[PDB]
Amino acid sequence: PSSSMADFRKFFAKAKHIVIISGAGVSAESGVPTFRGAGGYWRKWQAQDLATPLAFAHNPSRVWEFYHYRREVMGSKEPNAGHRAIAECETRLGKQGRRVVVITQNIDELHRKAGTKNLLEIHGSLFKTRCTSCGVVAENYKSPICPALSGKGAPEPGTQDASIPVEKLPRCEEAGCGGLLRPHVVWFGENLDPAILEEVDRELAHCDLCLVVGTSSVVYPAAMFAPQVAARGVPVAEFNTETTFRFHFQGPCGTTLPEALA
Ligand SMILES: [Zn+2]
């Protein structure tokens, strides 16, 4: 797999429909905790313990504390140079009639905060709710999302459950509903939204260039997407911090992407 930036730039100059698959590395470069890897814990748990329907079912207060913490944490985080290079790329090429689309597993909206408009959030967002009764999806940036969660969600091991009664957790504000909100995020063991998958598949089908950033082409979720793009003969360029498709560029996305997408 080539590491010739100058060859990649020749493809990039000619591309009219770029798909950018964005993974967790792009978020880790902004200091966003993932609660996934080795060492990534919230109290005594990781994401696979709390990001589950069963966990929300048994202890919705605890799960909301976890997600409340992740929302409020975002007030001190910023998009990095990788985010910015990707958004600036969409803006510039859009003025030329050229399409850029970002397909991300990240739920922290730093791509949006950087200015990306063409964004497919395949795991949802920290800043969207979904009513477990009526299914309405709504934007929610309120700090705190409800009064009972003010000051809750502390991550230190040893923090006690807030044990908020389900009635004082975030409730649906649709007239005549009032059901219990959940985070509008895809949990472990859950289906992706099929309308999103359909949109993903149309982009993968039409693109002439595909970028995989901050993750590996060989693992979920990019493994779902890059191979069928590569199968059609479309070049795929990987930007991650591994030591090993047409291109692989080693390093933080914030270092390589500004040059690659200039
Ligand atoms: Zn509702």
Curated annotation (Swiss-Prot):
Activity regulation, per record: Inhibited by suramin. NAD-dependent lysine desuccinylase activity is inhibited by physiological nicotinamide concentrations, while deacetylase activity is not. In contrast, resveratrol activates deacetylase activity, while inhibiting desuccinylase activity.
Catalytic site: 123
Coiled coil stretches, renumbered: none
Cofactor binding, note field: Binds 1 zinc ion per subunit.
Annotated NAD(+) binding sites: 23-42, 105-108, 214-216, 240-242, 253
SUPFAM superfamilies linked to this entry: DHS-like NAD/FAD-binding domain
Domain notes: In contrast to class I sirtuins, class III sirtuins have only weak deacetylase activity. Difference in substrate specificity is probably due to a larger hydrophobic pocket with 2 residues (Tyr-67 and Arg-70) that bind to malonylated and succinylated substrates and define the specificity.
Protein's recorded name: NAD-dependent protein deacylase sirtuin-5, mitochondrial
Upper lineage: Eukaryota, Metazoa, Chordata, Craniata, Vertebrata
